[PDB]
Design an enzyme around this catalytic site. Sequence first.
Site, PDB file in Angstrom:
ATOM      1  N   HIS A  78     -16.773  34.426  90.269  1.00 21.42           N
ATOM      2  CA  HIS A  78     -15.702  33.607  90.865  1.00 21.42           C
ATOM      3  C   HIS A  78     -14.983  32.817  89.783  1.00 21.42           C
ATOM      4  CE1 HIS A  78     -18.257  33.720  94.774  1.00 21.42           C
ATOM      5  NE2 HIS A  78     -17.855  34.913  94.395  1.00 21.42           N
ATOM      6  N   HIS A 233     -11.892  38.052  99.609  1.00 23.29           N
ATOM      7  CA  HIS A 233     -12.955  37.654  98.714  1.00 23.29           C
ATOM      8  C   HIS A 233     -13.536  38.786  97.858  1.00 23.29           C
ATOM      9  CE1 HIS A 233     -15.807  34.905  97.013  1.00 23.29           C
ATOM     10  NE2 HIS A 233     -16.627  35.943  97.027  1.00 23.29           N
ATOM     11  N   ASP A 237     -13.888  38.832  93.915  1.00 23.86           N
ATOM     12  CA  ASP A 237     -15.069  39.360  93.213  1.00 23.86           C
ATOM     13  C   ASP A 237     -14.701  40.458  92.205  1.00 23.86           C
ATOM     14  OD1 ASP A 237     -17.183  37.812  94.399  1.00 23.86           O
ATOM     15  OD2 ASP A 237     -17.455  39.313  95.972  1.00 23.86           O
ATOM     16  N   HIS A 260     -20.822  44.471  92.936  1.00 21.57           N
ATOM     17  CA  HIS A 260     -21.045  44.104  91.530  1.00 21.57           C
ATOM     18  C   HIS A 260     -21.571  45.271  90.698  1.00 21.57           C
ATOM     19  CE1 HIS A 260     -20.290  40.038  92.857  1.00 21.57           C
ATOM     20  NE2 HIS A 260     -21.178  40.233  93.818  1.00 21.57           N
TER      21      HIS A 260
HETATM   22  C1  LIG Z   1     -22.078  35.563  95.140  1.00 22.27           C
HETATM   23  C2  LIG Z   1     -21.286  36.846  95.268  1.00 22.27           C
HETATM   24  O1  LIG Z   1     -20.148  36.874  94.393  1.00 22.27           O
HETATM   25  C3  LIG Z   1     -20.783  36.970  96.633  1.00 22.27           C
HETATM   26  N1  LIG Z   1     -19.498  36.757  96.961  1.00 22.27           N
HETATM   27  C4  LIG Z   1     -19.380  37.016  98.282  1.00 22.27           C
HETATM   28  C5  LIG Z   1     -20.620  37.342  98.742  1.00 22.27           C
HETATM   29  N2  LIG Z   1     -21.476  37.326  97.716  1.00 22.27           N
HETATM   30  C6  LIG Z   1     -22.892  37.667  97.851  1.00 22.27           C
HETATM   31  C7  LIG Z   1     -23.766  36.561  98.451  1.00 22.27           C
HETATM   32  C8  LIG Z   1     -23.668  35.952  99.716  1.00 22.27           C
HETATM   33  C9  LIG Z   1     -24.666  35.022  99.792  1.00 22.27           C
HETATM   34  C10 LIG Z   1     -24.939  34.203 100.864  1.00 22.27           C
HETATM   35  C11 LIG Z   1     -25.228  33.470 101.772  1.00 22.27           C
HETATM   36  C12 LIG Z   1     -25.565  32.598 102.692  1.00 22.27           C
HETATM   37  C13 LIG Z   1     -26.417  32.875 103.791  1.00 22.27           C
HETATM   38  C14 LIG Z   1     -26.753  31.864 104.732  1.00 22.27           C
HETATM   39  C15 LIG Z   1     -26.244  30.553 104.575  1.00 22.27           C
HETATM   40  C16 LIG Z   1     -26.499  29.364 105.491  1.00 22.27           C
HETATM   41  C17 LIG Z   1     -27.556  29.618 106.574  1.00 22.27           C
HETATM   42  C18 LIG Z   1     -27.843  28.410 107.473  1.00 22.27           C
HETATM   43  O2  LIG Z   1     -27.292  27.204 106.936  1.00 22.27           O
HETATM   44  C19 LIG Z   1     -25.407  30.301 103.508  1.00 22.27           C
HETATM   45  C20 LIG Z   1     -25.071  31.304 102.585  1.00 22.27           C
HETATM   46  O3  LIG Z   1     -25.385  35.077  98.635  1.00 22.27           O
HETATM   47  N3  LIG Z   1     -24.844  36.019  97.818  1.00 22.27           N
HETATM   48 ZN   LIG Z   2     -18.158  36.466  95.593  1.00 19.94          ZN
END
Ligand SMILES: C[C@H](O)c1nccn1Cc1cc(C#Cc2ccc(CCCO)cc2)on1
Ligand SMILES: [Zn+2]
Length: 295
Positions: A78, A233, A237, A260
């Site tokens: 990001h 999004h 990414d 990724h």
């Molecule tokens: C980090 C990467 O670039 C990315 N971008 C979009 C999705 N992703 C993958 C991703 C996506 C995630 C995530 C997540 C998640 C799941 C549950 C909660 C809250 C539950 C109750 O409060 C909050 C967040 O972890 N990695």
């Molecule tokens: Zn992301």
Amino acid sequence: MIKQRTLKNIIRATGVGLHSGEKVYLTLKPAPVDTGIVFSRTDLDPVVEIPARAENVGETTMSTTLVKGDVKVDTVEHLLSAMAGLGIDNAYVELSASEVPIMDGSAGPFVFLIQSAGLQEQEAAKKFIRIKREVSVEEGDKRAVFVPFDGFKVSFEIDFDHPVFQQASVDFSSTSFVKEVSRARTFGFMRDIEYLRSQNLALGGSVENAIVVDENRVLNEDGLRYEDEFVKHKILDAIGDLYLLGNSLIGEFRGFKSGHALNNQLLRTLIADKDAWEVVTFEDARTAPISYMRP
Ligand SMILES: C[C@H](O)c1nccn1Cc1cc(C#Cc2ccc(CCCO)cc2)on1
Ligand SMILES: [Zn+2]
């Protein structure tokens, strides 16, 4: 000519790693010409530095992780997306822990801080990698593709088997990265809390930094920033992962359920096939296929 850029001033920010859940302090600093983007773990002694290049990507499970020996910088995508969107060529990124902070889950807070610091043009021509042949990688039903294109454009398509549903295509020479893509947030399904917090991932995840989706709906109270936020999004990414190339692209990327792992593999296949690309500069910005915001 199209000139290299760095930050005009230093900027600082604090937040939490999405995966690790750790408080981290972030410092973005200017850097000289041809430095590229270099990450630095300043909590270690001695300080460990990892250039943001395709060769240093060590893990691609739910984020893009830079790795040098036993030292990692997790979730670079990001921030790298924000750098690429505003055309930052050279910068030191200091971190007090192993993960870039998630902020609100999008690139908005990064583009804001960068532009607050301001940009500084440097006296060296910016180098671009121009796509001259189609390069495609596939694995089962997922695909990631570079196609020659006079500009820079990203097309993406996702197929989630879920009630909330997607595709989008953005030409970044005619539409704003900031307005149309930068605010699109990280997202996760409640389904995957089995997976994520069995692999001890997403430790810092909440509705404050991610769209949380159950079987039917977005649980975040104020809903979505864009009608097609998810696919937006994914485009964010990809832009981030592609910047690990070390130079800005002239071409078009097309993603079909990629992520990724498959994005990094495209870069590795691209780099290896030297007939498919060339390094170019533009002595006259007026005839160049892409353009950037005034500094
Ligand atoms: C980090 C990467 O670039 C990315 N971008 C979009 C999705 N992703 C993958 C991703 C996506 C995630 C995530 C997540 C998640 C799941 C549950 C909660 C809250 C539950 C109750 O409060 C909050 C967040 O972890 N990695
Ligand atoms: Zn992301």
